[PDB]
Amino acid sequence: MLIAIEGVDGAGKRTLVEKLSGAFRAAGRSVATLAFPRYGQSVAADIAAEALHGEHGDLASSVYAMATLFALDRAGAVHTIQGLCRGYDVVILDRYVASNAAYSAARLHENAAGKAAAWVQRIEFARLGLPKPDWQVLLAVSAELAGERSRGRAQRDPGRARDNYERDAELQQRTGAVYAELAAQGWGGRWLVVGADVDPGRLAATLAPPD
Amino acid sequence: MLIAIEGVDGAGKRTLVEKLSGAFRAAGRSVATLAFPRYGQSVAADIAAEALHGEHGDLASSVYAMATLFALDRAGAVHTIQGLCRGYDVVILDRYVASNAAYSAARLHENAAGKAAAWVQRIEFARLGLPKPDWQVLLAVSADAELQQRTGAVYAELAAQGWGGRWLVVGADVDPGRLAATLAPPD
Ligand SMILES: Cc1cn(C2CCN(Cc3cccc(Oc4ccccc4)n3)CC2)c(=O)[nH]c1=O
Ligand SMILES: Cc1cn(C2CCN(Cc3cccc(Oc4ccccc4)n3)CC2)c(=O)[nH]c1=O
Ligand SMILES: [Cl-]
Ligand SMILES: [Cl-]
Ligand SMILES: [Cl-]
Ligand SMILES: [Cl-]
Ligand SMILES: [Cl-]
Ligand SMILES: [Cl-]
Ligand SMILES: [Cl-]
């Protein structure tokens, strides 16, 4: 079973990955986890990170160029995703294809029914052959909490160096709304929308009901 | 020996590559050639091709995004270039890193000493470790028009300045035997 955890930066995605991992293992299921982008393991992801911190000229301002880099990074991980799914009962991804649909649409002021989200689905699922997740779990938290926890688009920089607090906060709002539309329409498969305090045992039971 | 053929007239480059290949082989040297971008053989190059035909949203309007795809195409080709050099006396590349410097600078209205050409050198040679060629041969006299003119002028300064290594600047009708003898002089 392949599960993707989705949401805006600062939602607490990794915390959920860990507690869900613990709940599955308590129920006798083996679990492996993987986070995107895969820094150090593709040129594409490293260039994207550098672009977010101001390198590479006008690269980051092209929404489709950044999205292409994140897709190429995932394409490089297909054998890992498939190998983990062979060796483990449950594979949990921190961010996956829907991240690309949500942020790209939001950067372009589009909704989930728009061109960017359709382009993401075509290029990643159809053209590059990424496996579809069995579940996509949207971790939806308050805009305020996400704003305080997010490190912004330049996540290497110390907090004292953030100066785009407004652009990033507006983008996160739009991205949250696209995510919600993605979940409502079953984009790429089944979705569940959960909060920060979701019980891990009961969440694991819902995602993989016992036989 | 690793040789890159450069210029704005690609139909002329291809003829030059063929005539040069024959001259090397006539001199007892085995030759392999490889063309960039590797259209039909890498996703990065194919996405770039599609972007030039209007696909992929705003991608083609970013000079650095397109340049990045061509760099990723070459980054994926390191073992091919290196393996060819290990298996053949002469490896001739039809377009190489300097193509990225010249076209990117020209699209941005910069010259050979500007930011884009420096960025190309830093990312492709210093960071991704593409092999430095023994020769870059600029085809400068052949047998968007303004963009082509600007690309030609950047090319000429790149060669004059030794960008990325040694350059030779030639016309199309240069004697292939002498050109082959110049690039890999017989013993
Ligand atoms: C794995 C993944 C991730 N992302 C983004 C997730 C958020 N992260 C940090 C962030 C936090 C706040 C604002 C912001 O603005 C962006 C987002 C995308 C591109 C450029 C700027 N970016 C950048 C990559 C994406 O766009 N597509 C993906 O496929
Ligand atoms: C191998 C290589 C090649 N090129 C270009 C060579 C010319 N080719 C076709 C062409 C012919 C005439 C104008 C033009 O303008 C461009 C160039 C780059 C990007 C967009 C448009 N493009 C596009 C790729 C490049 O920019 N970087 C490279 O690394
Ligand atoms: Cl998070
Ligand atoms: Cl386990
Ligand atoms: Cl980073
Ligand atoms: Cl840079
Ligand atoms: Cl933006
Ligand atoms: Cl060699
Ligand atoms: Cl001549």
UniProtKB/Swiss-Prot annotation, chain A:
<dbReference type="GO" id="GO:0000287">
    <property type="term" value="F:magnesium ion binding"/>
</dbReference>
<feature type="site" description="Transition state stabilizer">
    <location>
        <position position="153"/>
    </location>
</feature>
<keyword id="KW-0479">Metal-binding</keyword>
<feature type="binding site">
    <location>
        <position position="166"/>
    </location>
    <ligand>
        <name>Mg(2+)</name>
    </ligand>
</feature>
<dbReference type="GO" id="GO:0006235">
    <property type="term" value="P:dTTP biosynthetic process"/>
</dbReference>
<feature type="binding site">
    <location>
        <begin position="7"/>
        <end position="14"/>
    </location>
    <ligand>
        <name>ATP</name>
    </ligand>
</feature>
<dbReference type="GO" id="GO:0005525">
    <property type="term" value="F:GTP binding"/>
</dbReference>
<dbReference type="GO" id="GO:0005737">
    <property type="term" value="C:cytoplasm"/>
</dbReference>
<dbReference type="GO" id="GO:0005829">
    <property type="term" value="C:cytosol"/>
</dbReference>
<dbReference type="GO" id="GO:0004798">
    <property type="term" value="F:dTMP kinase activity"/>
</dbReference>
<feature type="binding site">
    <location>
        <position position="103"/>
    </location>
    <ligand>
        <name>dTMP</name>
    </ligand>
</feature>
<keyword id="KW-0418">Kinase</keyword>
<feature type="binding site">
    <location>
        <position position="100"/>
    </location>
    <ligand>
        <name>dTMP</name>
    </ligand>
</feature>
<feature type="binding site">
    <location>
        <position position="70"/>
    </location>
    <ligand>
        <name>dTMP</name>
    </ligand>
</feature>
<feature type="binding site">
    <location>
        <position position="163"/>
    </location>
    <ligand>
        <name>dTMP</name>
    </ligand>
</feature>
<feature type="binding site">
    <location>
        <position position="9"/>
    </location>
    <ligand>
        <name>Mg(2+)</name>
    </ligand>
</feature>
<dbReference type="GO" id="GO:0006233">
    <property type="term" value="P:dTDP biosynthetic process"/>
</dbReference>
<comment type="similarity">
    <text>Belongs to the thymidylate kinase family.</text>
</comment>
<feature type="binding site">
    <location>
        <position position="95"/>
    </location>
    <ligand>
        <name>dTMP</name>
    </ligand>
</feature>
<dbReference type="GO" id="GO:0005524">
    <property type="term" value="F:ATP binding"/>
</dbReference>
<keyword id="KW-0808">Transferase</keyword>
<dbReference type="InterPro" id="IPR018094">
    <property type="entry name" value="Thymidylate_kinase"/>
</dbReference>
<dbReference type="InterPro" id="IPR039430">
    <property type="entry name" value="Thymidylate_kin-like_dom"/>
</dbReference>
<keyword id="KW-0545">Nucleotide biosynthesis</keyword>
<dbReference type="InterPro" id="IPR027417">
    <property type="entry name" value="P-loop_NTPase"/>
</dbReference>
<feature type="binding site">
    <location>
        <position position="39"/>
    </location>
    <ligand>
        <name>dTMP</name>
    </ligand>
</feature>
<dbReference type="GO" id="GO:0006227">
    <property type="term" value="P:dUDP biosynthetic process"/>
</dbReference>
<protein>
    <recommendedName>
        <fullName>Thymidylate kinase</fullName>
        <ecNumber>2.7.4.9</ecNumber>
    </recommendedName>
</protein>
<dbReference type="Pfam" id="PF02223">
    <property type="entry name" value="Thymidylate_kin"/>
</dbReference>
<comment type="function">
    <text>Catalyzes the reversible phosphorylation of deoxythymidine monophosphate (dTMP) to deoxythymidine diphosphate (dTDP), using ATP as its preferred phosphoryl donor. Situated at the junction of both de novo and salvage pathways of deoxythymidine triphosphate (dTTP) synthesis, is essential for DNA synthesis and cellular growth. Has a broad specificity for nucleoside triphosphates, being highly active with ATP or dATP as phosphate donors, and less active with ITP, GTP, CTP and UTP.</text>
</comment>
<keyword id="KW-0067">ATP-binding</keyword>
<feature type="region of interest" description="LID">
    <location>
        <begin position="147"/>
        <end position="159"/>
    </location>
</feature>
<feature type="binding site">
    <location>
        <position position="9"/>
    </location>
    <ligand>
        <name>dTMP</name>
    </ligand>
</feature>
<dbReference type="GO" id="GO:0046044">
    <property type="term" value="P:TMP metabolic process"/>
</dbReference>
<keyword id="KW-0547">Nucleotide-binding</keyword>
<feature type="binding site">
    <location>
        <position position="74"/>
    </location>
    <ligand>
        <name>dTMP</name>
    </ligand>
</feature>
<dbReference type="GO" id="GO:0042803">
    <property type="term" value="F:protein homodimerization activity"/>
</dbReference>
<comment type="subunit">
    <text>Homodimer.</text>
</comment>
<keyword id="KW-0460">Magnesium</keyword>
<comment type="pathway">
    <text>Pyrimidine metabolism; dTTP biosynthesis.</text>
</comment>
<dbReference type="InterPro" id="IPR018095">
    <property type="entry name" value="Thymidylate_kin_CS"/>
</dbReference>
<feature type="binding site">
    <location>
        <position position="165"/>
    </location>
    <ligand>
        <name>dTMP</name>
    </ligand>
</feature>
